[PDB]
Amino acid sequence: IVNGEEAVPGSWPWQVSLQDKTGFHFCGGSLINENWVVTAAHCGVTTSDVVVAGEFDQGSSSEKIQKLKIAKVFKNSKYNSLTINNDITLLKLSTAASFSQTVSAVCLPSASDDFAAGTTCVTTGWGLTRY
Amino acid sequence: ANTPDRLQQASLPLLSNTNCKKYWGTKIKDAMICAGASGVSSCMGDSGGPLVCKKNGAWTLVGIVSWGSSTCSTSTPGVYARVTALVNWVQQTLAAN
């Protein structure tokens, strides 16, 4: 995020870091329950990647993070790689998350819920702060 | 480029797909929602993470960070997967697995 700010630690408890086997953060995701993470299809997650829950500071390993293996990747069959449309994948965890103060689920909308243009929302992540 | 160690946040507005198309044209599909162009931007490495809005007091997943400006321009809207267009598939997948 460019021109954002540091979050309060633990205050976005559904936010996960998707890391490859070398430990490199390559994408975010959101816990929707103890067993499932929602991410983008174009992130290309495989069962060799790791879901890291409970993280705040990726350079300080004093925190009680949960490194969760991925059992299966469910890329939405409607994903279109050419247009990046329907850009959603579900990750079924091999090991369930243990919900806590710093690890818990985001709500899903109903398909009929409305979010008007002009509404102020929030986005979070460990993406670049400057390109 | 700078990657942060610490989790970042930003507040930003939703756009309408019609207005987002002034920036992105026919690249915008019904299963996308735009947000930003407001002095902040999602950027590389944010993909897959949340765009949340409060609904009846609970943070609700409205978007999944997807794509946008290759330089993360803060005057151009970001594009997110529109979760209301995708939530039936989520529920079906969870039920079947």
Partner: peptide, 4 residues
Amino acid sequence: SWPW
């Protein structure tokens, strides 16, 4: 554009 670029994936994010």
